[PDB]
């Protein structure tokens, strides 16, 4: 039988998320020289942000989060932030025709290694009394907005740790600061970060991961019924 040899595991998000034991998964029992933890490390789990942070509102329901498995602790899968992304439906819905769609790619390495690429997207809007048939932006203002966004993100994220950077991205205080400080250049209908990807990780630390998770909830999977 196929599933008679399967064992259940808990995936544990880092401590800066409220729902610690999001998701569940199976794996082959260790058998021979093939150890379960040695194929479990490196698996990437995707979850809706609204599921992870229940206390968050409707905007959280449009953002997905991916976590990679650093270490196996019994039946818990300790994880580190891997990537974050807006869902396809929301990003597709944000597009209008008669406006400029300005995208910025920002690459920043956190204070503890952890290079990340930010992929910011913004849109022009008409003003309140504007009668024009379009709100296209001049190229100089687009380049200036891109330069400002690059500077702000690099400055804010190179200073902090990976966990605090994740908290800034998930509680979208960084995007709020960006729209507040970028609107004087061009009136913006929306400025949101559509995807964040960890592109380079530092060498594996045990103490850093144990400090990323705080109080690790127990896994009951190994116990008997």
């Amino acid at each position: 039988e196929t599933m008679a040899r399967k064992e259940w595991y808990d995936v544990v998000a880092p401590a800066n998320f409220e729902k610690r034991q999001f998701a569940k998964t199976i794996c082959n029992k260790t058998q021979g020289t093939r150890i379960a933890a040695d194929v479990l490390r490196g698996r990437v789990f995707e979850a809706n942000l609204a599921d992870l942070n229940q206390s968050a509102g409707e905007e959280e329901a449009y953002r997905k989060v991916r976590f990679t498995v650093q270490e196996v602790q019994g039946r818990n899968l300790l994880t580190q932030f891997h990537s974050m992304e807006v869902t396809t439906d929301k990003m597709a819905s944000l597009l209008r025709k008669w406006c400029t769609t300005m995208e910025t790619t920002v690459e920043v390495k956190t204070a503890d290694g952890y290079t990340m690429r930010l992929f910011v997207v913004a849109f022009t809007k008409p003003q309140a009394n504007q009668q024009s048939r379009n709100c296209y932006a001049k190229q100089r203002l687009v380049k200036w907005l891109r330069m400002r966004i690059t500077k702000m993100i690099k400055r804010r994220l190179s200073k902090v740790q990976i966990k605090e950077a994740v908290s800034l991205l998930t509680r979208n205080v960084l995007s709020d600061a960006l729209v507040r400080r970028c609107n004087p250049i061009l009136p913006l209908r929306e400025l949101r970060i559509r995807k964040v990807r960890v592109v380079r990780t530092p060498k594996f630390d045990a103490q850093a991961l144990l400090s990323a998770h705080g109080t690790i909830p127990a896994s009951v999977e190994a116990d008997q019924r």
Partner: protein, 135 residues
């Protein structure tokens, strides 16, 4: 064979519904995608080639998937829909809706639904000549 949770707790999988205009895939995995629980397709349910993309084959496949995943222990399903995508059609095949409805009706809880057909930000040349498919 299920996880050791209390009765009625929602244990989630992800279902990958791949409905082309030639076939329909109903594929349940965990939330990492790595481990597959069950995969039933329309061609597993019908005799004729012309019938695998149909809503009835898709519904039968979804019924099989629910039947097996109830003994897996999975009882809730996040949903990933896709058309063929890439440089081919982005419109889902006829069987996506029927498979999802049969999943919902047969007793599975539905979580997040998302459409994940591969979209290029720029592409290789698509099949056919510059004249297209000439019927």
């Amino acid at each position: 064979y299920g996880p050791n949770v209390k009765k009625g707790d929602l244990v989630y999988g992800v279902v990958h519904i791949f409905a082309s205009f030639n076939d329909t895939f109903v594929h349940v995995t965990d939330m990492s995608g790595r481990e597959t629980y069950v995969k039933v397709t329309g061609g597993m349910k019908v005799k004729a080639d012309r019938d695998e993309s149909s809503p009835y084959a898709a519904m039968m496949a979804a019924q099989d998937v629910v039947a097996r995943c109830k003994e897996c222990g999975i009882n809730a399903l996040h949903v990933k829909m896709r058309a063929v995508g890439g440089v081919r059609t982005k419109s889902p095949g006829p069987g996506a809706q029927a498979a999802l409805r049969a999943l919902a009706r047969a007793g599975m809880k539905i979580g997040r639904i998302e459409d994940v057909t591969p979209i290029p930000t720029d592409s290789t040349r698509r099949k056919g000549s510059r004249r297209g498919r000439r019927l």
